[PDB]
A paper describes a structure:
The RBD of SARS-CoV-2 spike protein (S) directly contacts the cellular receptor angiotensin-converting enzyme 2 (ACE2). It is the target of the most potent neutralizing antibodies. Here we engineer two bispecific antibodies (bsAbs) using distinct designs and compared them with parental antibodies and their cocktail. X-ray crystallography and cryo-EM reveal distinct binding models for individual cocktail antibodies, and computational simulations suggest higher inter-spike crosslinking potentials by 14-H-06 than 14-crs-06.
The atomic details of interactions established at the binding interface between Fab06 and RBD showed that VH residues N32, W34 from CDR-H1, S55 from CDR-H2, and T104 from CDR-H3 interact with RBD residues N450, K444, Y449, and R346 while the VL residues N33 from CDR-L1 and D52 from CDR-L2 interact with RBD residues T345 and R346, respectively. The interactions revealed by X-ray crystallography are fully consistent with epitope mapping results reported in our previous study. After superposition of the Fab06 and Fab14/RBD complexes, we found that Fab06 and Fab14 recognize and bind on distinct epitopes on the RBD simultaneously. After superposition of the Fab06/RBD and the spike trimer structures, no steric hindrance was observed between Fab06 and the RBDs adopting either the up or the down states, indicating that Fab06 can bind RBD in both conformations. Therefore, the two cocktail antibodies have distinct binding models on the RBD in the context of the spike trimers. The orientations of Fab binding to RBD affect an IgG’s potential for inter-spike crosslinking, which is an extra line of neutralizing mechanisms for certain RBD-targeting antibodies.
Residue numbers in the entry:
A (entry chain E): 1 to 134, 142 to 217
B (entry chain D): 1 to 212
C (entry chain A): 333 to 528
The structure:
Amino acid sequence: QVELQESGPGLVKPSGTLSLTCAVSGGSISSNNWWTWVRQPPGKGLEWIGEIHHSGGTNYNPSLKSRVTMSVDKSKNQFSLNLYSVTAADTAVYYCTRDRAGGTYSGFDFWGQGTLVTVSSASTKGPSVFPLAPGTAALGCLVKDYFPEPVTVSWNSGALTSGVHTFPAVLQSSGLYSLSSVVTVPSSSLGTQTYICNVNHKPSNTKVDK
Amino acid sequence: QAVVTQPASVSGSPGQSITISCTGTSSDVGGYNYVSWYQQHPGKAPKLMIYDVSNRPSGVSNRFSGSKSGNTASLTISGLQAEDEADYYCSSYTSSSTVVFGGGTKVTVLQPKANPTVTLFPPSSEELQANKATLVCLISDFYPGAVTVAWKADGSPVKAGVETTKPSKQSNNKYAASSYLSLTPEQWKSHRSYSCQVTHEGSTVEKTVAPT
Amino acid sequence: TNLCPFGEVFNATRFASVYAWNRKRISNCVADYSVLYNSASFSTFKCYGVSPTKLNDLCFTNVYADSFVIRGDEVRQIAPGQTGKIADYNYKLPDDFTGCVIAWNSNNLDSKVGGNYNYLYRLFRKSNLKPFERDISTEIYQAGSTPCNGVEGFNCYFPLQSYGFQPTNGVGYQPYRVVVLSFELLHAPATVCGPK
Ligand SMILES: *[C@@H]1O[C@H](CO)[C@@H](O)[C@H](O)[C@H]1NC(C)=O
């Protein structure tokens, strides 16, 4: 089925350029669907950014018109967004979605998972991952000192979904994040079953296992 | 562009029926029958629930009714289930050929008091090998979303090295928080006792950890 | 009470592309036609074989409402004995047509900045439609002498063409919503009647 996956840097320097690409799967971008970008600042509401059609048509928020451009790559089967002269106000989760049709707004059916884009003058810092040794017992993964958010934590390369709780990160006084992912398993499986921790930090190309 | 106002919060009780308003202009909600409602669960993309005022997409529960009168859209959720607890956003086409979203509405379904679940993790050998100590207190499944954390070493109060997160709603609508105690490998064996003191609705839960 | 659903047709949120025109059978009801007139300042309202004002006194077996969207330029083709892309390939009225053609500008609803590409029409076809025929086939049109083998490409075109309605277009090129009312009297009891 139709699947949308956003791609792009997680950190953009102030008065820089945000550039994202949504990759359409299970459906040609040449469909009669207005491919749209919608953003959401953390804890704040949704804001429609704009839209694009394969024919080349564009339409953008009057609020951001002067510093936004979108494009279509039919060969790669993806659409793009460029947000020039970025400010801290532009720090948000950027979603790529599509209208149920290529006419007047008819509602957005398919969405991407969202890509958090943090606009800050600070530099990118990779994380330091440490394992956390354990009725029912719990073992975890400490992902200390990273920036910017977020950090993907998988267990057993995706095979372990039950009992997995990744906690929201702590913004330390140093301006760095520390996050913990735990998994509650039975007392028998402790020495009988093997548990690996897959930590991923996209803004630093970090791919560490435990 | 246009301001589309929704009530900030709407609360209900299981089985009850609630209505979220979405008031706008004549250049938006009142001029076109192109209104859409979205349901957004924490940390997930919005879900299309109602399109063109009243039509619900294939697979949406029939308990979601969409209607409009003049310049006001109304999403009605009948027979509320806890899984309906989310943020609801209306949206509409505008005379400017743009789309505008509503302010959002936090819909809350009543839940019983839920006591926290605390887990304490001592500094890992790897952590101590890098000349750092971090004690993590992981609090989960609690309601309402407000706890206070206090740490103790060898039975003694700790006031520096304490970073506690704001409670955030988990998938099951219960809250989760985490307190991090930053120290040194010296201070870690410079004592024998290490305890977390989470106080939720008066009732306090304690967890302790020590090296070996 | 028991009034024929003209609102369901005229006031519909989205209209159909002319190639895929919608029909609505009106039957077993009271048809208050006086509303139709007091409804909107219809840019076009032509009748054939009937007076619109006599319809409240008449009884029909069935009434058919056919809705779709075309350009203002093409509204003149929604008449008997007409020729053009729409009359030939999309919607054909017979010479002996008995009913009314009602059209109105829907630039505010149907045109969009950058184009409204939901509204399509058949640009290519091997022959002309017979009156009231409806062709929905998206089969590849062979423009060249060599066959297509169902594969789109050079000299092999997709039959439908979009309008891409923009508000800045001329009045002739703007979207117009059209409702063609057809009145049918058969050798069966007439069920659709005007109010006394
Ligand atoms: C269409 O809607 C208007 C109000 O928006 C109403 O006054 C009119 O009678 C309706 N037209 C028909 C044909 O029912």
